[PDB]
């Protein structure tokens, strides 16, 4: 909308290190950002591109889940939602869901059902308090899917880290329930948490994301990969994230 809606310009008041992950990105274009809790420092590949704001797509379901927990639309004893009986192209969508199943399978109707129960003034208050990208709700429909709401790769890390780590009005059990829903991988060395996001425009991928965090025995790292061209899917952004986190020593 405004002159500032496509770009995040706020200086990092933080130690930062510039990375060169161009070989892993290959023919794809985009950025990678990681923050380390113990180091209090940002590691950035393609810093200019990390500040360009893009639709978050399904990565915003992180925030819809938090808001649905905070408003008690879903809880710990019940996060179940019955299927309304409409046929979707994937059978994982064609049944009852809980937060865990819906997050894992990016089941759109679950999160759309949550968003419809949340009043616009709450969301606006939340995006303001969280500094969530351009904060632009537009028509307030599926405003996070190739629509008015945009956020940069750098802000994806900053905002997620601050939401989880600051003592805010989001309770600790809601944060824990969100985390369980986002867990992808756990072994002796680490726990990897995250959420893909994929934008499709005219049958073509236009926008790929993977936003999350890693807990090791020694540190906690928030990260995000955004793809803007080449093959910009969430699945590709996830693959790129894993190669970079592994090269950086985060996964061992």
Curated annotation (Swiss-Prot):
The active site is at residue 58. It comes from the Bacteria. The modification N6-carboxylysine is found at residue 61. Changing residue 61 to A: Almost complete loss of the acylation step. Residues 1-252 are extracellular. Residues 1-252 are annotated as: Beta-lactam antibiotic sensor domain. Changing residue 58 to A: Complete loss of the acylation step. It is found in: Cell membrane. Carboxylation occurs on two lysine residues. Carboxylation at 'Lys-392' activates the active site serine residue for acylation. On acylation, the lysine side chain experiences a spontaneous decarboxylation that entraps the sensor in its activated state. Belongs to the peptidase M56 family. Integral membrane protein involved in sensing of the presence of beta-lactam antibiotics and transduction of the information to the cytoplasm. Mechanistically, activation of the signal transducer involves acylation of a serine in the C-terminal sensor domain upon binding of the beta-lactam antibiotic. In turn, a conformational change occurs and the signal is transmitted from the cell surface to the cytoplasm. This is Regulatory protein BlaR1. The chain holds residues 332 to 583 of 585 of the full protein.
